[PDB]
Amino acid sequence: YRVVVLSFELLHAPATVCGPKKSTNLVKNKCVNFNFNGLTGTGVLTESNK
Amino acid sequence: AYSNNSIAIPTNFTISVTTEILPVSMTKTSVDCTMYICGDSTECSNLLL
Ligand SMILES: *[C@@H]1O[C@H](CO)[C@@H](O)[C@H](O)[C@H]1NC(C)=O
Numbered sequence: 220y221r222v223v224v225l226s227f228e229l230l231h232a233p234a235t236v237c238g239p240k241k242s243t244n245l246v247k248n249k250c251v252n253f254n255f256n257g258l259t260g261t262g263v264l265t266e267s268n269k
Numbered sequence: 270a271y272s273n274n275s276i277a278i279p280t281n282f283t284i285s286v287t288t289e290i291l292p293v294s295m296t297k298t299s300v301d302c303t304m305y306i307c308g309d310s311t312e313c314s315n316l317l318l
Pocket residue numbers: 280281282
């Protein structure tokens with residue numbers, strides 16, 4: 220029984236891989252939950268000049 | 270100093286003015302409970318109760 224042990228990334232940020240996922244129009248300032256490459260957030264998104 | 274007979278009496282005076290600050294009111298914030306604790310989420314109204 221081949222017991223070769225493999226290991227992928229353990230809690231690392233996005234890399235040169237991109238899972239089979241689609242795309243959709245982005246959200247500029249809508250106060251809604253958003254999804255951009257897994258990360259999800261809610262509240263109000265406001266644009267700054269930083 | 271003093272003995273069986275003595276006393277001190279002022280001869281002139283001097284009017285003085287001094288401030289005394291005193292807090293009265295404090296800008297009152299109105300913080301709600303849900304949003305802060307939990308924003309807009311599907312499980313927000315079920316686990317909260
Ligand atoms: C006011 O005080 C001074 C000393 O500071 C004193 O010489 C004077 O006599 C006083 N005023 C009067 C009207 O006496």
